[model samples]
Target: AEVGSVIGASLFDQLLKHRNDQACEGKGFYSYNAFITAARSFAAFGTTGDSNTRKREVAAFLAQTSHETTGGAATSPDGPYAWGYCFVTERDKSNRYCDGSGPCSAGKSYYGRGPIQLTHNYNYNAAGRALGVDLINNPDLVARDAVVSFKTALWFWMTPQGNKPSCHDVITNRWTPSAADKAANRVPGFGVITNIINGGLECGKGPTPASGDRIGFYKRYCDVFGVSYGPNLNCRDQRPFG
Candidate 1:
């Protein structure tokens, strides 16, 4: 969505254009990795800063950090953080441990949202205070209000520890397959994403991205943002997904 992109490749660069504007006014991406990149940026900075990371711009980080939270949408079809919902409960904060005992309206707004995927009454209060939302009663505010939900999501991204670095900076993890992990000699596994989140393995060979893997990934992207695309006419890599 243009909400996150400046139609540029990196958040640092994209945000510089919106320094005076308060809304996503002109944010966007020109590459496929922008979503994840933007998410991380929103996580650390809150999108409030022109180029500064803040408590409200952390949504960009939480956007891709979900890679650690729930396998990046691979686990969305079931429950908890289900696909695109944010803050969906009143008593239970986590779906993994959620007992469905809270006031999770089947068709409401605060359905597990934000970067860290804040849900329930606990999160509504936190997000409301952190990023400025009042989901305690007006739970639908997250979805009904674009800026509110986005700001709240950015708020959730700040909840993590050591999240002050720029999404493109060294402190960030997914800034490309990483330096050492870019070797062809390395054999790939489910990739160390789980390991990255669990703090097990650092970085191994990245998931072999597939050709056309980035299909439907770009609105203006023509090549890999973090990885190398082959000489194919489609500019696709033979491997996809990590």
Candidate 2:
């Protein structure tokens, strides 16, 4: 969950050009090129402790993130907003809401971002308060811009909730597939999450899918991240798939 949304689109995904996609809503970035770039980006861009540990950490991270991005497909889709989605509202708060499109202002909630799909004016305001980026109308920049998006994802990844272990370990833990899910269920695990991203990214579509064909990415997900998964996972049940 921690790493899930951050690495792929569901987590507000990508930068550096393909950098990654902008996402439709909660979709994540997940193309073969993006995946490769993401690995390098995480190692080169984020802090995995130090340079040496960074490489190893990135490798481990990609292994899991790859599955999430690929969605069980061998490759990922291309283009901006290709993965899944980003900067969305998990809960509409019944009536309280914000707009991502037009008529936005300094205090608007559209500032929310990342795979865990942060949303709302208060959260965006908080991010602005710390990161100093005005989120209101430009929440799309959250995914378009690298450091800003990654920072938000890392922030959520490190959120210490009730002394519970972070979501990152959930995948690298005993059951690899168990840790992928970041959205939908909020802690659905990687196995389930990879499938979600795969559906959005069109993983099995072989680099470029046949034009205008709704390819079947579901089976592909099962093939890549499903089999030979780590055994006997004491998966921490946090939420179900959304």
Candidate 3:
């Protein structure tokens, strides 16, 4: 099943209506067509495994992105979880996100942008190289172009960071933790994916609100898709990847 088949325009709008309708910074920035077009570039994503597995992958991806781009509070109108994709760029734009490995371009900032809120100069350079875009020089393209923004999010989801498996593999059951991973409790599940994405901040330190919010989004998405939430839904007992 294709991503579009599972998450059509109606479903997409329903899931992110708050992001589009709410008076948020990213209002009207994201679109279902942009998401589908971006998924086309990552053919294996949300297209691998069985029907249930495919749906679960798409749900997990959206759940994670929703958490990253969320702009809700505890007392929001339709609730906080409904505000995914609320901001196209990071709220804090002070940082330039430059590093020695991926030096910053002049007058350009690589702060978080897109669905996944991709950050850092090295990440921009890598995503740009992978997608044939000059992100290092034009990092703002992620914020300006809807397709490119979603592509950067999908790129981050599909690509593995150092010492971490890609979120795609984790969701699709392709990643088997090593003995070291077992020792650290980095087992398979959505929780482990959290560790893979931002374990240093959110994982290995018990149940933080950030992890809880992520799980909430995942659960909401799973409920909408009629899929069961698998085990290890929280990373309270897991250690951050080295």
Candidate 4:
């Protein structure tokens, strides 16, 4: 599997260097096999057309997730970026993050969990339905099951979020900016993918530390993979998806 090969021991070390930490400490862990299984099932790497493009897709995915799960501190060992895979669930447990209709089951808390931080009752319901699991009723499954956790991330990467293009589409060059997208300055590239994920909150607000951090991970990943960082690496000028 090209995807598996690309995320070899070397690259995986970068993504999951802090996999075993105080919070998790073997309660759950990142699994290349799980990630590979999900990617192959969805043909994530292959569907992107070419080897370079495949690398870009994988890099982009890891970059975004790394930003989500990083636990590195400026004073930490290898800086913050090197501390990805440190946290699976959001540390801020204060917000239950339960939103939308009554699909949630009882006291289940729908907070950010897993690689992509699948939050909200709506996301849990959707991911659970597509993956044949009861994420709505058992939201913890996103963090409890490593395979399912990665599966949820893959699902989010592949699926479209209303008017926004799927992150996969943006990176693989399948999504063309609509008239609305153009008016908003949403071009096709890594920045566009960022907008797809958190445009409203993070995009259209000039330079943000979060955006810069995402770009840092992407470029570092591309360097590690021996590929060129493609165009549109920053989303500073683009408008958030509407």
Per-residue CA lDDT of model 2 for 1-242, tens digit only, reads 12232334432232212222343332343233343443343333334333333332333333333322222223545422123322233333343245444344644345334543555555555555555677655666555655565555444443323323343443334222233343223342333223232333433233324111112222222223333323221122323232
Rank the models by TM-score, top first.
3, 4, 2, 1
Tell me, by lDDT, which candidate is best: 3
Candidate 4 lDDT trough over 10 residues, lowest sum: 19-28
Worst lDDT window (10 residues) for model 2? 210-219
Output the number of the TM-score-best candidate: 3
TM-score of each: 0.35, 0.37, 0.97, 0.93
Give each model's clash number: 47, 28, 0, 0
**Judged by lDDT relative to the true structure, which candidate is superior, 1 or 4?**
4
**Tens-digit lDDT track for model 3 on 151-193?**
9989989988777899999999999899999999998899998
Candidate 3 residue 53 C-alpha distance from true site, Å = 1.1
**Which consecutive 10 residues in model 1 have the weakest lDDT in total?**
211-220
The deviation in Å at residue 44 for candidate 4 is 3.0
